[PDB]
Amino acid sequence: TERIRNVALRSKVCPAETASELIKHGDVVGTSGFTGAGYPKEVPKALAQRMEAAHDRGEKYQISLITGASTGPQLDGELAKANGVYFRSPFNTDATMRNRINAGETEYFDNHLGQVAGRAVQGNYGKFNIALVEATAITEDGGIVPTSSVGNSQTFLNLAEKVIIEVNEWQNPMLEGIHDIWDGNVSGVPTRDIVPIVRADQRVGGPVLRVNPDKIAAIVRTNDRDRNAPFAAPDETAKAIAGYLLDFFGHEVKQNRLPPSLLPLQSGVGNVANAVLEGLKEGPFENLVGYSEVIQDGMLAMLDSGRMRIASASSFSLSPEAAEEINNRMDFFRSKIILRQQDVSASPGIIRRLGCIAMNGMIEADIYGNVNSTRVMGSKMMNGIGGSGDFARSSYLSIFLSPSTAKGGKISAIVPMAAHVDHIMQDAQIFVTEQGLADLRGLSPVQRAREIISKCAHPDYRPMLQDYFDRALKNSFGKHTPHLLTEALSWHQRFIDTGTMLPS
Amino acid sequence: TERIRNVALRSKVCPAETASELIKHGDVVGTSGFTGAGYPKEVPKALAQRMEAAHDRGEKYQISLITGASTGPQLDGELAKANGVYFRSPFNTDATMRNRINAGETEYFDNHLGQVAGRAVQGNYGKFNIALVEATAITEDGGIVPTSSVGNSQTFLNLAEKVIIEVNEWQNPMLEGIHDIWDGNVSGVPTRDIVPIVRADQRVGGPVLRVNPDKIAAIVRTNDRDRNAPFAAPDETAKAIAGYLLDFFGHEVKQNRLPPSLLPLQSGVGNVANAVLEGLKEGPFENLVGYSEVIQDGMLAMLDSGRMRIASASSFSLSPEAAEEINNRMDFFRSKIILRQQDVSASPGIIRRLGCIAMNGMIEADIYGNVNSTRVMGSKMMNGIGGSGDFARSSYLSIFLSPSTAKGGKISAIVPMAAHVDHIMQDAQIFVTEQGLADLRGLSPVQRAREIISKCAHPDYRPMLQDYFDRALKNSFGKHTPHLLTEALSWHQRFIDTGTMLPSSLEHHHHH
Ligand SMILES: CC(C)(COP(=O)(O)OP(=O)(O)OC[C@H]1O[C@@H](n2cnc3c(N)ncnc32)[C@H](O)[C@@H]1OP(=O)(O)O)[C@@H](O)C(=O)NCCC(=O)NCCS
Ligand SMILES: CC(C)(COP(=O)(O)OP(=O)(O)OC[C@H]1O[C@@H](n2cnc3c(N)ncnc32)[C@H](O)[C@@H]1OP(=O)(O)O)[C@@H](O)C(=O)NCCC(=O)NCCS
Ligand SMILES: [Cl-]
Ligand SMILES: [Cl-]
Ligand SMILES: [Cl-]
Ligand SMILES: [Cl-]
């Protein structure tokens, strides 16, 4: 079953090594790939090998790598090992690339995922020399069918001077038809178009990405799997978090502040948000609808149990066993999933209009409910902000989820002051840990503190937090958001110095 | 001429004092008022008097005060002096109210101005007992014509149990027609409506606020002026900032990254703004368009010259001289201005669609370009975040402007780490001080730092900043966003302890 159904384009098929030779040192390369789904694989490997060879000969050979979101070991992993990426945007989860970033060997900036397409069109990343995009198939009309994610692929195809397509036989042919690619101006030159989405399950586009065939310089036939980590089966900590939130939603419904079927759900990357979805798959809320950035195992379970009717997202983020599950049951799931451009799925105008409920994980929050999603001790990148800002600020309800402690209790997830801020107080209304739920709506900072400390803090750390806060109220420069600047960041320094936030 | 053209409502006219008696201890009160414009005046004054009298007899008397944005002396000032506000939102510029907030005598939360209506409808502030709105006139069918701002007035009218109107004859009658009020679902229950604004000069609604006449409990005839602030005449610092920004606009135009008429302009509230508006007034760019929260003296002038074709905002932000140059020629300016609900003028979907250029002031930024707009030393409130968040994140271009120092040079506006964050790195692309302009587009945090330090920081503080950065690069826990947590906030603590961020030479400092 020929995947390249356009006859004329078959003449552009060539090996990965030859194709990679189109990528020059200094090139800006835009690729498909979103949370371990749909990134190119074979051309990156071939590139990485040639990069290492060139480095030994003393030839500079690095690229700027712009993606949808995070990719996999074949892309981020291989290129980082080869020391071949001088700039990376906007999101990564590969350990080797992360090490490059945190060692200052690769420059990194995690843009709001929903803005990357627009900033690319604006020229923020420079001119795109190459778009490297993985496809399920190429239609007779020359349409490019995406794989397990859409990401920024349409925008990258538009901008790039040259186009390389990887047609991956591994990807299920029945992916064709699952995507919704819109013809309108979302992230182009102002004035942009109104995106006529008024329901999360509404399609407004077509099944294929469009590209001038004259720009396609090479097509590489591939056969290699998406690779992403499994999710942690929800333990007692995660299940407690799920329990608190579901109870919360329940009361909201009883008070008629939410409909019985809630509102369109966004669930972010990570184990905790996934654990919540596992809770929802057997919860008291029916006819649920997903308007998310990614579909993780838990959301897939919800569609399976029937609690969720349909899920909109830009990408899959499935475990190896979940991915294998959906590709055996593509018949069932295909009619319940819509994969959109990432600048549509994370469009603020749409998110607010739909009234999405945002559920996201976090590194830490301070007592006033400022949120760190990214930088441990304020300097060491974990993954990136992703679309968490897109959704948190635009949502009807912004909810953040975390164990109250980290690293076996040696770190408190509730701190005097966040070492880095991704989400300001105004962007966070609800906090949930295994200790309880803090509802911050309508509260001043001092009021937010009392709630967060009492409800969410771990018993090991709560008195220390209360000690900080009470002395801050006595001594702070101002009393609106009381701080003791001499010790605001001292818990983080203590961890650095001793390996634990707990004093001796 | 009679301002109340609806006969039936005329019998609800009563004195300010009588009207104020409707407001009871513990009430949530929603009022009109936005950047010194269109706030109620006489009822709050009477309310404050009765509050003080109660307090003098050991009787509690306080309200929750929710507004459009900042008000004026007759409202925030009077009530703060009376200590009659237990909770305040979302924005304040009154000195007395600011003292109450910073002493913890008034609880305060500065929501995004564009989100306030929605959060009120959600019930975040509780049940609204009273709506108190200033009006230019009341039409034949009972429509309420706003005055010099729209703010959240329509939402407050919908929510409140009882309504009080102040009909202010100081406000020019020809304000009627300048407002655009939508009956569509902007900030109500999901699913909300598409707000179909695709041009900055587009009207989608009507000229009046709508309210059930049965809820109007009192109408007060008033005659009192809006009270804002004198003209902030641009100093050499502000002029320098304006100069650098205009050079930047010029360059973007020549590289075809902006059209010759630029894009719809949002100008923040502040003194640096006028310098920029003055600059645009004499600049090379024609057919300018305003899509902002406020309309300042500078915008008025460009509208007058035809330099700017239209200005959309939620409110006036004028000097007293500007307040009546426009009330002499309201006839003229009413055709050049559209005043919208603030949840429309600060709507993210619309701001992004129109591709607005956002220009806002700041307290400080750290070397990595995270921005503080609100809390001095991290704990003391200035004004509030306002709509700066609405615009900065949604804009086509996000620009922040500030003197490179504060308090006669004793504070650096560029610091190792911001004491508080309102706008994260991702929400800020351009920084401008009197020292220069930093273009941060496409840069990593370390790259952002090299630009901000070399272009924007004051020469008095640059070697200190470079020293912190250099040693952070060597020693930071991670090297992606290098920090020394031992001294990240030490400059702020230095100011608290000694009144200056500059170190003494009686002790060692690495940059020496
Ligand atoms: C913040 C985030 C890392 C949390 O992940 P999670 O899987 O729910 O939470 P976990 O408790 O399993 O923690 C994951 C990792 O973060 C670390 N971590 C979490 N909180 C921490 C803290 N306070 N201090 C230090 N490390 C912390 C854990 O140790 C773990 O790292 P490790 O496996 O190397 O030991 C993740 O949600 C994220 O990257 N968010 C940003 C993107 C986003 O939210 N996008 C939303 C739209 S799709
Ligand atoms: C941040 C803000 C206060 C700056 O105002 P501005 O007029 O450009 O700037 P100025 O340099 O005149 O300073 C304003 C005040 O802040 C103080 N200030 C500014 N930077 C400071 C700093 N780094 N440290 C301490 N104080 C500082 C000034 O001393 C002055 O205070 P003062 O009245 O006690 O003397 C103002 O823009 C603001 O409140 N912004 C938030 C609202 C907003 O942006 N809304 C969206 C647009 S409608
Ligand atoms: Cl839209
Ligand atoms: Cl709130
Ligand atoms: Cl809209
Ligand atoms: Cl950028």
Residue numbers in the entry:
A (entry chain B): 2 to 505
B (entry chain A): 2 to 513
What does the paper say about this structure?
Acetobacter aceti strain 1023 and other acetic acid bacteria use succinyl-CoA:acetate CoA-transferase (AarC) in a variant citric acid cycle that is required for a robust acetic acid resistance (aar) phenotype. Strong selection for key roles in acetic acid resistance and central metabolism appear to have optimized the structural and functional properties of AarC, making it an excellent representative of the class I CoA-transferase superfamily. Class I acyl-CoA:carboxylate CoA-transferases produce reactive acylglutamyl anhydride intermediates that acylate CoA, forming either an acyl-CoA product and a free enzyme or a protein glutamyl-CoA thioester and a carboxylate product. A closed active site enables AarC to engage, immobilize, and desolvate acyl-CoA substrates and to stabilize covalent adducts of Glu294.
AarC-N347A lacks the carboxamide moiety proposed to contact the internal oxyanion formed during thiolysis of the acylglutamyl anhydride intermediate. The mutant retains appreciable (~15% of wild-type) specific activity. A data set obtained from a crystal grown in the presence of CoA was used to determine a structure in an orthorhombic space group. All three regions in subunit B adopted the closed conformation. Since AarC-N347A retains significant activity, our hypothesis was that a polar group would simply supplant the missing Asn347 carboxamide and restore its function. As anticipated, an active site solvent molecule was observed at this location in each subunit, with a lower B-factor in subunit B (HOH 775A and 787B: 58 and 34 Å2, respectively). The solvent substitution, however, additionally appears to influence the conformation of Glu294. While Glu294 in the N347A mutant adopts the tt-0 rotamer observed in other closed structures, its χ3 value is unusual, corresponding to a rotation of the attacking oxygen toward the mutated residue (i.e., away from the CoA binding site) [Any value of χ3 is permitted in the Glu tt-0 rotamer]. The resulting misalignment of the key carboxylate may decrease the likelihood of productive nucleophilic attack on an acyl-CoA substrate and affect the reactivity of covalent glutamyl adducts. Without Asn347, Glu294 moves from a position suitable for nucleophilic attack on an acyl-CoA substrate by a carboxylate oxygen syn lone pair to one better aligned for attack by a less-basic and less-nucleophilic anti lone pair.
